Structure formats: structure tokens, C-alpha cells
Amino acid sequence: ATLARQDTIDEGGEVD
Amino acid sequence: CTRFSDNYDIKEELGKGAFSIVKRCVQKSTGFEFAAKIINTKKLTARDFQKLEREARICRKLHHPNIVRLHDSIQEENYHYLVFDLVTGGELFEDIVAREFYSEADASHCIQQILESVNHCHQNGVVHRNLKPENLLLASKAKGAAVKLADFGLAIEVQGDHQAWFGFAGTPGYLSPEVLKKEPYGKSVDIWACGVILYILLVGYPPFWDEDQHRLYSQIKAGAYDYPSPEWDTVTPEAKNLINQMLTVNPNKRITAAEALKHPWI
Ligand SMILES: Nc1ncnc2c1ncn2[C@@H]1O[C@H](COP(=O)(O)OP(=O)(O)O)[C@@H](O)[C@H]1O
Ligand SMILES: [Mg+2]
């Protein structure tokens, strides 16, 4: 395990 | 618009995340320098454009010494520009790998500032949703340099304690159990990420990690982590206490930012 950069994700799915 | 291209000279790359590149730029009229977050918008959908407006809106609302300041938001034909004050010390991420880890003293001070920026968001009804060292910028390379919270691309608004399904988003190793369980969630997800960050500050690697992402998410949800020797042998239990309170799986039982800032270790 190490500190590595990680990309943002956004799969939405937000619900009213 | 050509309002950015006309008025700014672009210089070198500073950083990039999943869907932007940030370059230093200079305003022609003043010779003042800024950071221009550049997003190609040719490929982008209606939802993606609303997210840009949301980003710009929420950043402006949260203006504060420990939050990056938005100078302008400009849409040209093929690109959008969010022009921010320049923060010159680089990402907290870099500084951590440069040093491997922070002493308890420096970790304590650093997480205090991070939590102050997060609490500033929370008491103004914003959940950031993407706390991680890549999104925390340092005013300089000096010890205890001011920390600036950045990257409001995912930030959304919420009233107080309220929780709702705001969608599956964030950065994997920092995601909260509740987001991963697809449960309604709220400000408290940022505190989980602050737990992950504080753990990283102390030993220089993350408490949840696996090459298999399905397994990583398992570990997070189960809150499965420990304090392996010899890394953690010299670390005070009080520091470990503060991490435990942040890495509490049930968000209702999770420490808030306000009462994190009161921990004896802080
Ligand atoms: N105001 C700034 N000053 C200096 N570097 C910055 C600034 N804002 C962002 N950066 C750099 O650009 C990177 C991406 O910024 P961000 O807002 O995070 O775009 P993304 O949505 O692509 O992550 C940051 O991780 C950092 O390295
Ligand atoms: Mg980022």
C-alpha cells in the first residue's frame, strides 16, 4: 500500500 | 467569449485531475498571476455544464481564507476557464510523499486547518464530497503553511444533519461506507475522508488499499483497518483515537468537524 494519486469519479444516480 | 484568451497569457502546468488541467496564467492588464483550471467542453453534456456553474457558484459562496478564491469563470467556444488565486506551495499530496509522513505535531496542525476548511463548508450547508490530499493546496513549502481547500467540482448543498442520495461520486480510497452502500448521506462523508487523510499524514500510506477495487470498497464498508508495526508503534494512542472517531462506519455515530477540532490531540 502506498500513497498514489487517484482520479475523481461521478456516476451520478442522484434521486429526488 | 474570447474574454480569457484576450486578457490572460497561459504559462506552465500546475496540476491535473480527472477532467481538468490547471495552468498558471498571467492577467495582461495587471501582470498578476493566477491558476486557470481548464476544462475542454466540446465533449460535454448538459449535466456537465450545470456542474461547472455549480462549481463556480459554490466556490464563490464559500469565500474564506482557507478556501481557494475564484477570480473569474469564462466560457470560450471549446473551453471553460475557472481562474483562481494561485497557491504556490503545491498539493499537500506532494509534500506528504516528499517527507513520507508528518510528525504528530505537524500532522496535528495540518489536520486542524483541513478540518477548519471543511467545517467552514459544513456550517454554510455544503458537503464537498472529494476531500483528499490532491485537493488541499499549501500556501508554501514552509512548515505549517496555510492549507487551502480546493476542487469544488462535486460539492453540493445540504441542510444541517440532513441526508439524501446525492449520487455515486468522490475518489475511491476516500469514499465513505455510506456512499459505497448507496445509502443517503450528508456532510459526514467529508469527515470520513479527513480520517483517511489524517491516517496518511501519520504513516504516509492509506488505511484502505487493495489492487482489487471491489476488495478496496469491501474494506472501506467494513471499516477494516489497523495500525501495523513498526510504523505506528511510536504514534500516540490519542492520535489513533481521533482517527477512530473519524473512521466510524455508521455516519450517525461519526464525529463532526466541529467536535473534531476540540479533540485533545488537536
Ligand atoms: N489555485 C490553484 N493554485 C495552484 N495549483 C492549483 C490550484 N487549483 C488547482 N491546482 C492544481 O490543479 C489540480 C486540479 O485542480 P482541480 O480543481 O482539482 O481540477 P480536477 O477536477 O481536475 O481535480 C490540483 O490537484 C492542483 O495540483
Ligand atoms: Mg482534484
Per domain, the residue ranges of chain B are 1-86, 87-266
What is the sign of the dihedral through the CA atoms of B253, B259, B263 and B266? positive
Torsion of CA A4, B194, B201, B120, to 10 degrees: 110
Q: Rounded CA gap, B239 and B237, in Å? A: 5
Q: Measure CB to CB from residue B165 to each of A3, A6, A15 and give the nearest one.
A: A15
Q: Rounded CA gap, B167 and B179, in Å? A: 8
Peptide bond connecting B230 to the previous residue in cis, omega within 30 degrees of 0: yes
Determine the residue type at B204.
G
| DSSP string for residues in B100-153 | SS--HHHHHHHHHHHHHHHHHHHTTTEE----SGGGEEES-SSTT--EEE---S
CATH of B87-266, one of 3.40.50.720, 1.10.510.10, 3.40.980.10, 1.10.287.110: 1.10.510.10
Nearest CA in chain B to A6: B171
Torsion of CA B91, B58, B157, B138, to 10 degrees: 20
Of the CA atoms within 13 Å of residue B216, those in its CB half-sphere come to 15
CA B109 to centroid of chain Cα atoms: 17
Q: In chain A, count of helices (H) and strands (E)?
A: 0, 1
Q: Which CATH architecture group holds B1-86?
A: 2-Layer Sandwich (3.30)
Q: Which residues contact B12 (CB under 8 A, 6 or more apart)?
A: B23, B24
Same fold yes or no, B1-86 and B87-266? no
| Ligand 1 binding pocket includes B93 (Cβ within 6 Å) | no
Q: Rounded CA gap, B196 and B20, in Å? A: 24
Q: How far is B31 from chain A (nearest CA, A)?
A: 33
- Count other Cβ atoms within 10 Å, centred on residue B131: 27
Q: Smallest Cα–Cα separation from B86: which of B31, B17, B128?
A: B31
Residue B96 in contact with partner chain A when CB distance is under 8 A:
yes
Three cell numbers, residue B134: 490532491
Mutate to test the interface with A, among B50, B100, B166 (most CBs of A within 10 A): B166
What is the sign of the dihedral through the CA atoms of B95, B21, B126 and B84? positive
Q: Smallest Cα–Cα separation from B36: which of B55, B22, B51, B19?
A: B22
For B20-58, b/e burial (b = at least 16 CB within 10 A) is bebbbbbbeeeeebbbbbbbebeeeeeeeeebbebbbeb
Q: How was this structure determined?
A: X-ray
Residue B226 in contact with partner chain A when CB distance is under 8 A:
no
Q: Tell me the β-bridge partners of B185.
A: B164
